[PDB]
A = this chain, B = another copy of it.
Amino acid sequence: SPRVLVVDDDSDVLASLERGLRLSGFEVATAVDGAEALRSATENRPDAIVLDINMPVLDGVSVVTALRAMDNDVPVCVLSARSSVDDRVAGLEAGADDYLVKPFVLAELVARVKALLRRRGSTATSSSETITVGPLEVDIPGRRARVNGVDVDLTKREFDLLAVLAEHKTAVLSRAQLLELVWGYDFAADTNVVDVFIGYLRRKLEAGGGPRLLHTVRGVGFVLRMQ
């Protein structure tokens, strides 16, 4: 009953993923390149999209870029070959919500797709008032972050992360807690998605040129706090 659009230009992989997800309980639509992805996404509006990065015609990065420019927040998990790192990172930066490296076992994708759906248009936060951490203001309801009055341009998943960290300002959250609260994971994962997104957030928070607000507590977790 959730509709998942799966996009890959490798016809074996696409057929396999189609088979795998349909059997796992999803209504599945497919596309072979990013143009067909955007057509499919536009004409059918999937609940989630599984999106290969390196494709002809329009790549996965472009597809993501395009969706997000249209304010289309559909959850997206990008797929990439192992070696195609600085590149899957591009999809995440451009606005994908999660990634999975090939080859993967099908359970890894199903689990992340159910998480994607659990956390589509998101946060597990109750704050209504804007949250201040030094010069940073995190407006959860208005989905707006500002540092010294200047908006910080964040993707939907960067913002969800910052929002969870602001909701628990000054508290340390572990990778595992952040996978559950932000990504909606209900399973143990081998993933550095939290680390990658902490990198992006911190770079954005610091681009102005002042204090580190977002701290890595080695072996324990991450914390948003002034000083």
Interface residues of A (CB under 8 A from B): 9-10, 33-34, 54-59, 62, 70-74, 81, 83-87, 123, 125-129, 140-143
Contacts and interface: CB of A to CB of B under 8 A. Distances in A.
- Which 3 A-B pairs rank lowest in CB-CB distance, beginning with the nearest? A71-B85, A57-B127, A54-B141
Given A56-B126, A59-B141, A72-B85, 8 more contacts: A54-B142, A56-B129, A56-B140, A56-B141, A70-B85, A71-B84, A71-B85, A73-B87
Nearest to A11: B129
Contact of A128 (B34, B56, B86): B56
B141 A55 contact: yes
Contacts of A56: 125-129, 140-141
A71 B83 contact: yes
Nearest to A71: B85
State the majority secondary structure of interface residues on A.
loop
Contacts of A141: 9, 54-56, 59
A125 B62 contact: yes
A85 B72 CA distance: 8
A88 to B, nearest CB: 10
A123 B9 contact: no
Nearest to A87: B73
A85 B9 CA distance: 30
A123 B62 contact: yes
Contacts of A81: 142
A85 B62 CA distance: 20
18 contacts: A9-B141, A33-B127, A54-B143, A55-B141, A56-B125, A56-B126, A56-B127, A56-B128, A56-B129, A56-B141, A57-B125, A58-B125, A59-B125, A59-B141, A71-B85, A71-B86, A72-B86, A81-B142
Contacts of A71: 83-86
